[PDB]
């Protein structure tokens, strides 16, 4: 009568990590276990009717670890399914960045990106993206005029852009977080568009 869990997938953004599965249960409950690949299993979500489990508190302890998960099925030898392997540092989606400020400095514009807070905690400090990634983190800018003749591109190792602009022209700005050294999930989603005179 019990159905084993399937399509086990990690949903992770800025280290906020949720495991998800199928199916939506009928007369059954689930227990989720998590372990580091070498270490021991630990149960987190107990006899739940939910098809998801928040595992952030476990993964924030060591973000440079490979994690495994399994979901057991019980009615309301036990049936189970293993998840794909998950290494948070390499695989977590970079969240939506925000343009902090844009200022007109002479014949140039300075655009600054917010140093986005994550859920990773060291004592009484909630780590920013720069804190976690360091040199690995890079930002890309898209900038265009009122009459869009193709979107131009800029890159920075820091959180600041210095771009050559034309006088009187109102520009619109969009920013993106990039970890070039990743296999997967290298680029974040686009920042909200910030325009000169808005």
């Amino acid at each position, epitope marked *: 009568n019990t159905v084993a869990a399937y399509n086990l997938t990690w949903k992770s953004t800025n280290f906020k990590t949720i495991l998800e599965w199928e199916p939506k249960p009928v007369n059954q409950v689930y227990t989720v276990q998590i372990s580091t*690949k070498s270490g021991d299993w630990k149960s987190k979500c107990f006899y739940t009717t939910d098809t998801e489990c928040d595992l952030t508190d476990e993964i924030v302890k060591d*973000v*440079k*670890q*490979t994690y495994l998960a399994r979901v057991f099925s019980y009615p309301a030898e036990p049936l189970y399914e293993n998840s794909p392997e998950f*290494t948070p*540092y*390499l695989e977590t989606n970079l969240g939506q960045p925000t343009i902090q400020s844009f200022e007109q400095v002479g014949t140039k514009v300075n655009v*600054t*990106v917010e*140093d986005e807070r994550t859920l990773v905690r*060291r004592n009484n400090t909630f*780590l*920013s993206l*720069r*804190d*976690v*990634f*360091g*040199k*690995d*983190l890079i930002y890309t800018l898209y900038y265009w005029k009122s009459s869009s003749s193709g979107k131009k591109t800029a890159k920075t*190792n*820091t*959180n*600041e852009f210095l771009i050559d602009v034309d006088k009187g022209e109102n520009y619109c700005f969009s920013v993106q977080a990039v970890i*070039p*050294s*990743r*296999t997967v999930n290298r680029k974040s989603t686009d920042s909200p568009v910030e325009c000169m005179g808005q």
Partner: antibody
Amino acid sequence: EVQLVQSGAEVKKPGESLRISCKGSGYTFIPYWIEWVRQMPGKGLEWMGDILPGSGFTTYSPSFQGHVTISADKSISTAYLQWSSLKASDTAMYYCARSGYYGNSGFAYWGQGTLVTVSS
Amino acid sequence: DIVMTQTPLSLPVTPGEPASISCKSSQSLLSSGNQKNYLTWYLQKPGQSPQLLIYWASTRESGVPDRFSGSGSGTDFTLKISRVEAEDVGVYYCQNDYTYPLTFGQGTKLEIKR
């Protein structure tokens, strides 16, 4: 504990190819950068380059680009440094190092070193 | 390339008294977003591999005694040892840990004065 084990000492003629290795254990191999550092007899430290074993992505120092290749085999937790043809001035100690846990937190763990002798 | 300059080149210290090594960078090592100075200190003892001592200019790696301390901002940085013993001898290196390519100083030899 975290251990970096490098391959044994090498004695080579000029113009010969060489590959030296650095095996990592006691940690998850893929999300940590492996660094290569040259130290010539009685001299300072020179950063040669690095590799992220999870992808194979490499950065090189402008001084070392084209002279060396850095690679990794993540299934056996091993990184590599190799030459096409060695010069006599390649006679040095070579260290592999692993990066720290937090961003830009230095090279936290070092291997014992590989002495490379290039002579006629 | 960010050039790292160390003064002095050699430092004789009597047992029990303080030691001060200075590192200067040609470019700023301060990151504006998180207000962190990306300087790293190392110790290489005779016949040994380098050891990590301090990162983020002033944060100690676990295992490193509290007698080691870093300070400074932007371009000027300092490593202080409060009470020098025999096992503290060797060459001290600062490192640009801010931007590629990664660069080391020449090194400061610390020896016991007698």
